[PDB]
Design an enzyme around this catalytic site. Structure first.
Site, PDB file in Angstrom:
ATOM      1  N   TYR A  59     -11.144   3.630   2.763  1.00 29.72           N
ATOM      2  CA  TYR A  59      -9.516   2.773   2.248  1.00 29.72           C
ATOM      3  C   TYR A  59      -9.472   2.400   0.953  1.00 29.72           C
ATOM      4  O   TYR A  59     -10.899   1.061   0.891  1.00 29.72           O
ATOM      5  CB  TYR A  59      -8.854   2.374   2.960  1.00 29.72           C
ATOM      6  CG  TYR A  59      -7.643   1.848   2.290  1.00 29.72           C
ATOM      7  CD1 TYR A  59      -6.861   2.026   1.655  1.00 29.72           C
ATOM      8  CD2 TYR A  59      -8.075   0.450   3.171  1.00 29.72           C
ATOM      9  CE1 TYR A  59      -5.672   1.479   1.356  1.00 29.72           C
ATOM     10  CE2 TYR A  59      -6.855  -0.273   2.836  1.00 29.72           C
ATOM     11  CZ  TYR A  59      -5.888   0.121   1.977  1.00 29.72           C
ATOM     12  OH  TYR A  59      -4.795  -0.902   1.142  1.00 29.72           O
TER      13      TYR A  59
ATOM     14  N   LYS B 293       1.106   3.184  -3.267  1.00 24.00           N
ATOM     15  CA  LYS B 293      -0.397   4.409  -3.920  1.00 24.00           C
ATOM     16  C   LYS B 293       0.279   5.901  -3.557  1.00 24.00           C
ATOM     17  O   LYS B 293      -0.022   6.478  -4.220  1.00 24.00           O
ATOM     18  CB  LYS B 293      -1.491   4.364  -2.378  1.00 24.00           C
ATOM     19  CG  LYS B 293      -2.049   3.344  -2.811  1.00 24.00           C
ATOM     20  CD  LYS B 293      -3.535   3.511  -1.684  1.00 24.00           C
ATOM     21  CE  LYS B 293      -4.550   2.419  -1.510  1.00 24.00           C
ATOM     22  NZ  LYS B 293      -3.662   0.925  -0.894  1.00 24.00           N
TER      23      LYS B 293
ATOM     24  N   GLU C 120      -1.225  10.514   4.703  1.00 24.25           N
ATOM     25  CA  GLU C 120      -1.619  10.536   6.144  1.00 24.25           C
ATOM     26  C   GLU C 120      -1.253  11.794   6.855  1.00 24.25           C
ATOM     27  O   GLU C 120      -0.038  11.852   7.287  1.00 24.25           O
ATOM     28  CB  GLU C 120      -3.044   9.575   6.537  1.00 24.25           C
ATOM     29  CG  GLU C 120      -3.641   8.838   5.543  1.00 24.25           C
ATOM     30  CD  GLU C 120      -3.602   7.291   5.746  1.00 24.25           C
ATOM     31  OE1 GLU C 120      -2.528   7.118   7.254  1.00 24.25           O
ATOM     32  OE2 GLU C 120      -4.259   6.666   4.900  1.00 24.25           O
TER      33      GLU C 120
ATOM     34  N   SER D 268       0.613  -1.063   0.353  1.00 25.91           N
ATOM     35  CA  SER D 268      -0.039   0.167  -0.184  1.00 25.91           C
ATOM     36  C   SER D 268       0.739   1.192   0.168  1.00 25.91           C
ATOM     37  O   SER D 268       0.382   2.191  -0.328  1.00 25.91           O
ATOM     38  CB  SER D 268      -1.287  -0.082   1.337  1.00 25.91           C
ATOM     39  OG  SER D 268      -1.762  -0.774   1.643  1.00 25.91           O
TER      40      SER D 268
ATOM     41  N   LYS E  11       2.328   6.878   6.129  1.00 23.78           N
ATOM     42  CA  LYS E  11       1.833   6.260   4.816  1.00 23.78           C
ATOM     43  C   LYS E  11       2.667   4.848   5.800  1.00 23.78           C
ATOM     44  O   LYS E  11       3.605   4.549   5.630  1.00 23.78           O
ATOM     45  CB  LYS E  11       1.696   6.253   3.648  1.00 23.78           C
ATOM     46  CG  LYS E  11       0.969   5.936   3.237  1.00 23.78           C
ATOM     47  CD  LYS E  11      -0.155   6.268   3.342  1.00 23.78           C
ATOM     48  CE  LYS E  11      -0.235   5.293   2.356  1.00 23.78           C
ATOM     49  NZ  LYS E  11      -1.422   3.688   3.151  1.00 23.78           N
ATOM     50  N   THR E  12       1.036   4.171   5.804  1.00 23.06           N
ATOM     51  CA  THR E  12       1.716   2.597   5.968  1.00 23.06           C
ATOM     52  C   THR E  12       1.590   1.564   4.956  1.00 23.06           C
ATOM     53  O   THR E  12       1.334   2.098   3.463  1.00 23.06           O
ATOM     54  CB  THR E  12       0.596   2.097   7.071  1.00 23.06           C
ATOM     55  OG1 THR E  12      -1.037   2.059   6.441  1.00 23.06           O
ATOM     56  CG2 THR E  12       0.595   1.911   8.842  1.00 23.06           C
ATOM     57  N   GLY E  13       2.199   0.590   4.461  1.00 24.42           N
ATOM     58  CA  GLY E  13       2.092  -0.081   3.949  1.00 24.42           C
ATOM     59  C   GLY E  13       2.444  -1.945   3.975  1.00 24.42           C
ATOM     60  O   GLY E  13       3.011  -2.042   5.091  1.00 24.42           O
ATOM     61  N   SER E  14       1.473  -2.761   4.020  1.00 20.66           N
ATOM     62  CA  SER E  14       1.564  -4.037   3.881  1.00 20.66           C
ATOM     63  C   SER E  14       1.313  -4.997   2.704  1.00 20.66           C
ATOM     64  O   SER E  14       0.744  -4.566   2.001  1.00 20.66           O
ATOM     65  CB  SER E  14       0.556  -4.293   5.091  1.00 20.66           C
ATOM     66  OG  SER E  14       0.739  -2.823   6.522  1.00 20.66           O
TER      67      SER E  14
END
Ligand code: CL
Ligand code: SR
Length: 357
Positions: free
Chosen positions: A144, A61, A266, A58, A309-312
Site C-alpha cells: 500500500y 485514491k 479492494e 485514502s 475501501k477505507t479512508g482515514s
C-alpha cells in the site's frame, strides 16, 4: 424504515467510539438515503448537515484511479506500458519496468507507504523516483503506497496533457455532479469544513503535502461520494466512456490471499466473514508486503462480491462498501479516526439488518 435499521447502529457506534459527527449515505435501487448525525465540530457544536465537508484521506485514491482508468478508455493511457513512457523524465529508472496498473493495484515493486521527508516538491520527488530501487518483485507483491497512487495521478495528468485537479474536476467530478468535492477548500466554505479528532481526542486537520491531491486530499460530502458509488452500481445517468471507466476500476487484477485487488477498490467474494474484512484493513495487510498473483483470466467486474475501501486522516474515518449484486452501497464518513474494525462491523450490521447480506 431504513432509518429504523440504521439510526441505532450509528448511535451505538458514535457512543462507543466517541465520534462527534457522521454523514451516511445508503444507495439502493428505489433511491438514496442521506443521514446526518452529531456535530461537525465538537467545540462549537455546529451540527453536521447537507453542506458539511469531510476529509476522506485514502478514499481519494478511488477518484485518482477512476480518472486514470478514463485516460485508458480514451486511448491516451495504456495501463500495461512502463510509467517512464508518459513521464520520460524517469527513463532509465525502475519505472521502465513498472506500469500504471502496478501503481493502481499497489504492486509497483515495493514502493513505500509515505513520501519521505527529503522530498519537498515535484523536482525533489522525480529525483527520488529516479534513484529508488525496488525491494519486492514487481507485479508479485502488494505494498500500500501513497508514492505509487500519486505517481499514477502524475502519469494520468501527463497523458491527458493537463494538471491533476482541474482535469479531475472536468472529467470525473463535474460529470458525476460532485460539486461539493474539494481538493483545496475555498474560503467561503470553511464554515462547512468539519473539524477532525484524533485517537487522543485532539482537534486536527490535514496538512498540505507532496502528492496530497493524488493520494489523500479530497474533502467532500457523503452525498457526493454516493454519486460515485451510484455510478459504480449502475444507478446513475452517466456518459458511456465514464461509465466504462468506472466499471474498469472494479476489474480484479491480483489475488492477495482472500482479497481481490482491483483498481484501488479492494474486494471479496460472498459469503465473506467480518474477520476476513478486518484482516484486509489491518497491520498485516496495510503495513506489510503481501504476495500478489496477477489474475490471468483478468476478471470482469463481478456481481457476487463485497467491494470496499477505507479512508482515514489523523482526524477522520471513512468507509465505502458496495454489493454490486444487490445494487446496494454504503458511505460512512466520520470526523474521528476510529478503528477499521468498528467500520467493518457497523457496515456489516447495517447491511445485514437491511437484508443485503
Ligand atoms: Cl505521505
Ligand atoms: Sr498539491
Amino acid at each position: 424504515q431504513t432509518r429504523e435499521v440504521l439510526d441505532p447502529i450509528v448511535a451505538s457506534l458514535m457512543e462507543a467510539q466517541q465520534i462527534p459527527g457522521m454523514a451516511i449515505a445508503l444507495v439502493r435501487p428505489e433511491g438514496t438515503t442521506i443521514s446526518h448525525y452529531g456535530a461537525a465540530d465538537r467545540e462549537t457544536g455546529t451540527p453536521v448537515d447537507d453542506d458539511t465537508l469531510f476529509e476522506i484521506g485514502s478514499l481519494s485514491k478511488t477518484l485518482t484511479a477512476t480518472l486514470a482508468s478514463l485516460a485508458e478508455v480514451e486511448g491516451k493511457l495504456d495501463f500495461d506500458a512502463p510509467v517512464s513512457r508518459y513521464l520520460p523524465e524517469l527513463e532509465g529508472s525502475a519505472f521502465d519496468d513498472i506500469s500504471g496498473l502496478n501503481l493502481g493495484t499497489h504492486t509497483g515493486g515495493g514502493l513505500p507507504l509515505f513520501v519521505p521527508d527529503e522530498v519537498t516538491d515535484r523536482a525533489s520527488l522525480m529525483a527520488w523516483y529516479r534513484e529508488w530501487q525496488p525491494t519486492e518483485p514487481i507485479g508479485e507483491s502488494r505494498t500500500y503506497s501513497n508514492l505509487g497512487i500519486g505517481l499514477l495521478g502524475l502519469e494520468t495528468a501527463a497523458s491527458l496533457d493537463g494538471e491533476f485537479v482541474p482535469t479531475m474536476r472536468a472529467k470525473v467530478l463535474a460529470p458525476l455532479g460532485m460539486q461539493d468535492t474539494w481538493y483545496d477548500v475555498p474560503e467561503a466554505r470553511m464554515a462547512d469544513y468539519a473539524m477532525g479528532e484524533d485517537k487522543d481526542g485532539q482537534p486536527t486537520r490535514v496538512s498540505p503535502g507532496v502528492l496530497d491531491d493524488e493520494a489523500y486530499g479530497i474533502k467532500t460530502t457523503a452525498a457526493d461520494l454516493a454519486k460515485l458509488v451510484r455510478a459504480n452500481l449502475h444507478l446513475a445517468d452517466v456518459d458511456a466512456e465514464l461509465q466504462q471507466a468506472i466499471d474498469a476500476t472494479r476489474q480484479g487484477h491480483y489475488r492477495v490471499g482472500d482479497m481481490t485487488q482491483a483498481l484501488i477498490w479492494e474486494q471479496y467474494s460472498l459469503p465473506v466473514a467480518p474477520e476476513t474484512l478486518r484482516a484486509g484493513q489491518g497491520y498485516d495487510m496495510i503495513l506489510e508486503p503481501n504476495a500478489a498473483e496477477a489474475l490471468e483470466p483478468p476478471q470482469s467486474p463481478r456481481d457476487d462480491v463485497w467491494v470496499n475501501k477505507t479512508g482515514s486522516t489523523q482526524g477522520f474515518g471513512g468507509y465505502i462498501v458496495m454489493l454490486p449484486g444487490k445494487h446496494t452501497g454504503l458511505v460512512m464518513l466520520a470526523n474521528k479516526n476510529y478503528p477499521n474494525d468498528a467500520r467493518v462491523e457497523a457496515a456489516y450490521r447495517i447491511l445485514s439488518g437491511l437484508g443485503a447480506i
